[PDB]
Structure 1
Amino acid sequence: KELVLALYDYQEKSPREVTMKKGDILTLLNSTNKDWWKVEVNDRQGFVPAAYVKKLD
């Protein structure tokens, strides 16, 4: 599946959110929303800001 790189640290602030660290390689689950992307961070799934991630194709 599509991978993204974490460009910044992100601490979750809401139920549906996940935390990530700068340099994390995440699996992209859904990128239909322009602002919020659903990813898998190691073992956890949830939203992070689309802007803090970079798609690796």
Structure 2
Amino acid sequence: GAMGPREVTMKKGDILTLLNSTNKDWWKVEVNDRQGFVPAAYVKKLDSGTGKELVLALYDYQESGDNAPSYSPPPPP
């Protein structure tokens, strides 16, 4: 199953609002209607020009219920 009603999953090649990136080992990102803490290693700030806050998903991730990064980020592919 999936913890929490709102689960954020980053898809390789998907854009996710650069949510509170305060964390260094984890960059918060939203997904349409589901947000959560994710490993910055799976994402990376892009370049547009306007000045928005977006981050492409380099790798695939899965978050079950907005949870704080109390542990280290998972190993990428």
Name the SS of the counterpart of 1:51 in structure 2. helix
Give 1 or 2 for the bigger CA radius of gyration. 2
Q: 2:7·2:34 contact (CA, 8 Å) conserved in 1? A: no
Structure with a larger share of its residues in strand: 1
Letter in 1 for 2:22: T
Q: Moved runs in structure 1, 4+ residues, more than 3 A? A: 13-17
TM-score by length of 2: 0.48
Runs of 5+ consecutive residues of structure 2 not aligned to the other structure: 48-77
What percentage of aligned pairs have identical amino acids? 93
Runs of 5+ consecutive residues of structure 1 not aligned to the other structure: 1-12
Q: Note the alpha carbon deviations across 1:15-55, whole angstroms, 9 max, x for none.
A: 58621210110001111111111111122111110111010
RMSD: 2.2
Q: 1:37·1:50 contact (CA, 8 Å) conserved in 2? A: yes
Q: 1:17·1:48 contact (CA, 8 Å) conserved in 2? A: no
